[PDB]
Write a protein that binds this ligand. Structure first.
Ligand SMILES: *[C@@H]1O[C@H](CO)[C@@H](O[C@@H]2O[C@H](CO)[C@@H](O[C@@H]3O[C@H](CO[C@H]4O[C@H](CO[C@H]5O[C@H](CO)[C@@H](O)[C@H](O)[C@@H]5O)[C@@H](O)[C@H](O)[C@@H]4O)[C@@H](O)[C@H](O[C@H]4O[C@H](CO)[C@@H](O)[C@H](O)[C@@H]4O)[C@@H]3O)[C@H](O)[C@H]2NC(C)=O)[C@H](O)[C@H]1NC(C)=O
Ligand SMILES: *[C@@H]1O[C@H](CO)[C@@H](O[C@@H]2O[C@H](CO)[C@@H](O[C@@H]3O[C@H](CO[C@H]4O[C@H](CO)[C@@H](O)[C@H](O[C@H]5O[C@H](CO)[C@@H](O)[C@H](O)[C@@H]5O)[C@@H]4O)[C@@H](O)[C@H](O)[C@@H]3O)[C@H](O)[C@H]2NC(C)=O)[C@H](O)[C@H]1NC(C)=O
Ligand SMILES: *[C@@H]1O[C@H](CO)[C@@H](O[C@@H]2O[C@H](CO)[C@@H](O[C@@H]3O[C@H](CO)[C@@H](O)[C@H](O[C@H]4O[C@H](CO)[C@@H](O)[C@H](O)[C@@H]4O)[C@@H]3O)[C@H](O)[C@H]2NC(C)=O)[C@H](O)[C@H]1NC(C)=O
Ligand SMILES: *[C@@H]1O[C@H](CO)[C@@H](O[C@@H]2O[C@H](CO)[C@@H](O[C@@H]3O[C@H](CO)[C@@H](O)[C@H](O)[C@@H]3O)[C@H](O)[C@H]2NC(C)=O)[C@H](O)[C@H]1NC(C)=O
Ligand SMILES: *[C@@H]1O[C@H](CO)[C@@H](O[C@@H]2O[C@H](CO)[C@@H](O)[C@H](O)[C@H]2NC(C)=O)[C@H](O)[C@H]1NC(C)=O
Ligand SMILES: *[C@@H]1O[C@H](CO)[C@@H](O[C@@H]2O[C@H](CO)[C@@H](O)[C@H](O)[C@H]2NC(C)=O)[C@H](O)[C@H]1NC(C)=O
Ligand SMILES: *[C@@H]1O[C@H](CO)[C@@H](O[C@@H]2O[C@H](CO)[C@@H](O)[C@H](O)[C@H]2NC(C)=O)[C@H](O)[C@H]1NC(C)=O
Ligand SMILES: *[C@@H]1O[C@H](CO)[C@@H](O[C@@H]2O[C@H](CO)[C@@H](O)[C@H](O)[C@H]2NC(C)=O)[C@H](O)[C@H]1NC(C)=O
Ligand SMILES: *[C@@H]1O[C@H](CO)[C@@H](O[C@@H]2O[C@H](CO)[C@@H](O)[C@H](O)[C@H]2NC(C)=O)[C@H](O)[C@H]1NC(C)=O
Ligand SMILES: *[C@@H]1O[C@H](CO)[C@@H](O[C@@H]2O[C@H](CO)[C@@H](O)[C@H](O)[C@H]2NC(C)=O)[C@H](O)[C@H]1NC(C)=O
Ligand SMILES: *[C@@H]1O[C@H](CO)[C@@H](O)[C@H](O)[C@H]1NC(C)=O
Ligand SMILES: *[C@@H]1O[C@H](CO)[C@@H](O)[C@H](O)[C@H]1NC(C)=O
Ligand SMILES: *[C@@H]1O[C@H](CO)[C@@H](O)[C@H](O)[C@H]1NC(C)=O
Ligand SMILES: *[C@@H]1O[C@H](CO)[C@@H](O)[C@H](O)[C@H]1NC(C)=O
Ligand SMILES: *[C@@H]1O[C@H](CO)[C@@H](O)[C@H](O)[C@H]1NC(C)=O
Ligand SMILES: *[C@@H]1O[C@H](CO)[C@@H](O)[C@H](O)[C@H]1NC(C)=O
Ligand SMILES: *[C@@H]1O[C@H](CO)[C@@H](O)[C@H](O)[C@H]1NC(C)=O
Ligand SMILES: *[C@@H]1O[C@H](CO)[C@@H](O)[C@H](O)[C@H]1NC(C)=O
Ligand SMILES: *[C@@H]1O[C@H](CO)[C@@H](O)[C@H](O)[C@H]1NC(C)=O
Ligand SMILES: *[C@@H]1O[C@H](CO)[C@@H](O)[C@H](O)[C@H]1NC(C)=O
Lengths: 342, 348
């Protein structure tokens, strides 16, 4: 009896968690009353030095908006428990005429690149992208909804019939940058070292509004050039920074959603696929004790696997022991049991 | 005893092999004496319906050149035993001051896409890519060496552009290439420059040239694209456009492919580009520990590789970096990046 269990865990001590208030030990200082029941993470892991988490935030939210947290962490086995802090609930769009679906599509495309690459790099952090433009027209902040203000990519208008800007990716093995457009102007990023050109022409669509479509390029270091044919130019101000190549190690991603009253999405589930990712989810509504949206038994149970080492990680779940079981593990990592007759 | 064995094999009947003369059951017709000793494949498999192979050819060779074979096959587990038919032995380059190194770079990048994608598609074949160019110039063939004449991408020379279409597949591999370095024109130097543009998604893929350490030849990138209506655009005098594509069909659960090293006898220079292309988790690389010494002639019918292919004569439970474990119950080593039903190395 060694069943596949619905938890995130680790083979050894070499792991790292990226999360939000539900695993942010520092949030307790900002709330009254002061206790840890808002967390799904067990408080014994607070001192572990293996968690980079921030209340109200997500990796995607930090990537695109001024509400920035510098998520930073290193490990062989990466675990994610965030994403909810940019959801349909927030109803983000650039204008009144925008579309939240475009932004849900972006969320899904972004996290796909995060997960794929964190299966091959130990280290994730942010860097500020140095960009230079001689057409000093400032940035406008041309995309706002409530307290969410877009600052990556930056907008540049022309001031002192074609606009360009230089940017520089440095210090990391590989970087994610956003390349975006509103769905008649084109947008190119050009690597001057390699000669590779990435671009986006604008084209209409039938079932959406009018908002910023982003693609997330996984780029090398180099001296780049952002170019545009018409008036507006978009350029990266932030990048996910990948370091320290490792043997392929699937990441673990926990479903980050609200209580059913608020509207959530399944874009991290879409992004999380085999062989690079295992998706864990409770079989219940998120019903928190601190408030309705924080401190749930189902998700506390999933995260409880971080309190011990486990042998084998599979699509069905985690097997603690490496010898025998009654189910064949799919897409395994670690020392895995057989389910043959012996 | 259940060790990781050095063979290519299959979990069940659902498999397919892509290869060359060393698994070409026809060809016996075109040689004298008529003996199957030239193959590393076992003749018993000749009527399996699961081999697409052609003597003298390789997938990369058919992709790029006039010497075309329509490689075609479908299976959950895919095995490749080809590649040697484009090697430094052939010493290909376009012009006088060309570079084979560039074409090995090209080889490595092509097979990287082939193996990655045959991990997630059942069916592989070739489609001809039809293109419309409205100028007077023809698709001329200026880049060849021996009996190898480049026909993909095409090469048009009178801003010039041409339509092209990707139909018949879920996804396609097409070449986007340029010549390295800056070409001269009326004192002023200019950069080689080619874009492809999807008119539906709006995505623009492009290449411009740069200075890199002599050896001026065609640098290709191999884009994995969806069906749609495309535009090939040039900012230089010359236009390049895809004439063939690798055609992927029938999405499948992730199933690592198996690649067998394809080299010559050591008297001829081979390359390791398929090894570089074959990496975990999407590919397992099998190679013998000896020099290729063939029996029909020096380059055909080797013991080491005949041994590796013999695993196709039976079903095997578990596939891993170290090799194929036949049985799914118990073993002495822990399988790395396993596929199938794998044994434990634990003490019961
Ligand atoms: C070299 O020779 C080979 C062999 O003669 C030639 O190979 C053939 O190439 C042609 C293209 O020239 C291919 O046609 C296309 O096939 C696609 C796939 O069709 C099959 O799969 C479809 C979907 O399968 C999925 O669903 C089923 C459930 O129903 C599952 O079983 C399966 O697992 C999948 O999940 C099936 O619907 C279909 O019946 C086939 O089984 C098609 O998608 C493709 O359609 C395009 O064109 C259509 C117009 O006819 C149009 O309707 C569509 O819009 C679409 O754009 C098209 O039919 C052959 O598949 C291919 N055969 C083989 C054996 O490889 C090759 O052309 C030749 N090359 C040269 C250069 O000469
Ligand atoms: C992760 O896990 C959770 C739990 O398994 C998944 O939650 C389900 O999410 C799907 C997709 O969004 C929902 O599908 C909707 O179903 C609606 C009708 O469903 C009724 O039937 C269910 C009983 O068979 C019942 O559970 C459900 O009520 C639930 O939500 C109520 C919220 O007001 C709450 O009062 C109840 O306590 C109960 O929890 C409904 O009566 C349908 O109208 C929609 O169109 C849509 O199809 C499921 O309902 C969700 N189920 C639960 C229990 O929350 C979640 O999708 C998983 N995440 C990912 C990313 O896959
Ligand atoms: C598949 O398997 C076969 C056998 O396992 C394997 O064959 C080996 O290939 C390599 C590379 O072609 C050969 O390596 C050479 O070995 C000799 C000594 O016998 C060395 O002196 C050579 O040294 C070179 O590299 C040095 C680096 O410091 C240079 O200084 C020097 O100038 C030389 O160029 C060279 O490495 C090896 O002999 C064969 N062995 C056999 C038994 O054939 C093949 O490489 C494998 N294929 C792949 C893709 O891995
Ligand atoms: C070369 O000249 C031909 C003229 O024969 C140009 O043909 C044009 O091709 C485009 C793209 O296929 C056609 O547009 C398409 O129209 C259909 C239906 O209207 C639509 O379904 C497609 O989405 C697309 O919009 C266009 O009609 C056609 N023009 C004519 C006059 O027939 C072609 O553009 C030229 N190619 C180059 C590279 O200059
Ligand atoms: C899981 O295994 C790891 C080894 O990778 C253990 O980590 C060690 O924990 C002790 C504390 O008792 C430290 O002194 C070591 O420095 C740790 N090493 C590393 C690499 O973190 C960990 O204790 C194990 N967990 C459990 C619950 O036994
Ligand atoms: C990169 O950019 C961010 C955002 O502007 C900088 O974050 C600010 O840093 C200052 C000084 O540490 C703080 O006072 C602010 O509170 C920070 N803002 C936020 C939203 O966190 C960051 O300093 C920059 N980092 C580097 C290395 O240049
Ligand atoms: C996020 O935090 C990390 C971790 O401190 C920062 O990493 C430092 O980056 C600088 C270069 O700007 C290096 O010289 C340091 O050695 C790095 N680490 C430390 C501990 O000093 C990273 O720059 C931060 N990113 C942002 C956008 O603020
Ligand atoms: C931590 O404090 C919170 C207060 O927010 C406590 O939450 C209570 O949970 C129980 C569950 O039965 C309810 O009876 C209360 O109504 C909850 N109060 C609120 C405001 O949500 C929680 O019990 C405390 N836990 C510890 C260990 O101190
Ligand atoms: C794709 O293009 C190739 C051009 O090489 C076609 O193959 C040739 O077809 C002609 C006419 O049947 C034959 O006489 C030649 O022998 C073929 N050449 C080679 C190298 O095999 C092929 O028929 C085209 N396929 C489709 C479906 O149009
Ligand atoms: C598989 O491994 C587990 C993990 O050690 C074994 O569990 C032990 O089983 C013995 C039976 O004699 C118990 O007394 C111990 O309490 C268990 N130890 C632990 C640490 O859980 C299990 O027996 C092994 N199964 C087989 C068939 O070899
Ligand atoms: C979109 O938002 C920007 C500022 O975020 C604003 O300048 C602009 O007026 C808005 N668009 C429309 C159509 O009002
Ligand atoms: C902006 O001007 C500086 C010199 O003042 C130059 O070095 C830089 O490359 C310019 N950027 C662009 C995009 O032209
Ligand atoms: C792409 O959009 C630009 C507008 O900036 C336009 O000039 C061009 O015509 C479009 N692409 C093509 C292939 O026509
Ligand atoms: C995500 O939700 C969409 C809603 O239409 C659904 O079609 C899709 O199957 C879902 N994907 C996953 C991975 O849950
Ligand atoms: C596993 O069981 C099978 C019987 O079908 C056979 O290979 C052998 O008995 C077992 N393996 C070993 C190594 O004993
Ligand atoms: C074919 O060649 C092999 C290798 O020399 C030889 O042993 C065998 O006898 C040959 N078969 C026939 C039918 O001549
Ligand atoms: C490349 O070779 C062709 C003939 O194959 C020759 O005419 C041409 O001049 C060469 N290219 C250049 C740039 O000189
Ligand atoms: C590449 O080269 C052409 C000239 O050959 C130049 O006009 C074009 O702007 C370059 N492409 C990019 C993206 O800068
Ligand atoms: C291929 O060959 C080069 C040396 O020419 C070597 O550096 C590289 O690591 C080799 N790769 C493999 C997979 O054998
Ligand atoms: C492998 O299994 C299939 C059934 O899935 C069977 O028909 C076939 O004969 C087996 N192959 C061999 C070589 O025994």
């Amino acid at each position: 009896y060694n069943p596949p269990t619905n938890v995130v865990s680790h083979v050894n001590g070499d792991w790292f968690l990226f999360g939000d208030s539900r695993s942010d030990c520092n949030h307790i200082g900002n709330i009254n009353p002061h206790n840890y029941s808002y967390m799904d993470l067990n408080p014994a892991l607070c001192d572990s030095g293996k968690i980079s988490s921030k209340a109200g935030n997500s990796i995607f939210r930090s990537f695109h908006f001024t509400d920035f947290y510098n998520y930073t962490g290193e490990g062989q086995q990466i675990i994610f428990y965030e994403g909810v802090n940019f959801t349909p609930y927030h109803a983000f769009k650039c204008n009144r005429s925008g579309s939240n679906d475009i932004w849900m599509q972006n969320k899904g495309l972004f996290y796909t690149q995060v997960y794929k690459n964190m299966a091959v790099y130990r280290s994730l952090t942010f860097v500020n992208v140095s960009y230079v433009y001689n057409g000093s027209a400032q940035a406008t902040a041309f995309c706002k909804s409530g307290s969410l203000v877009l600052n990556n990519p930056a907008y540049i208008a022309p001031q002192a019939t074609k606009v360009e800007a230089d940017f520089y990716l440095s210090g990391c093995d590989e970087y994610i940058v956003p390349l975006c457009i509103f769905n008649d102007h084109s947008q190119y990023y050009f690597n001057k070292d390699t000669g590779v050109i990435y671009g986006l022409n604008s084209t209409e669509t039938i079932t959406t509004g009018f908002d910023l479509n982003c693609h997330y390029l996984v780029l090398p270091s180099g001296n780049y050039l952002a170019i545009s044919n018409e008036l507006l130019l978009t350029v990266p101000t932030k990048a996910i920074c990948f370091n320290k190549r490792k043997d392929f190690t699937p990441v673990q991603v926990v479903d980050s959603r609200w209580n059913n009253a608020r509207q959530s999405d399944n874009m991290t589930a879409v992004a999380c696929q085999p062989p690079y990712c295992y998706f864990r989810n409770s079989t219940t509504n998120y019903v928190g004790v601190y408030d309705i949206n924080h401190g749930d038994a189902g998700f506390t149970s999933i995260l409880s696997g971080l309190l011990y080492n486990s042998s084998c990680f599979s699509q069905q779940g985690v097997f603690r022991y490496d010898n025998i079981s009654s189910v064949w593990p799919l897409y395994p990592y670690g020392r895995c049991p057989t389910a043959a007759d012996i």
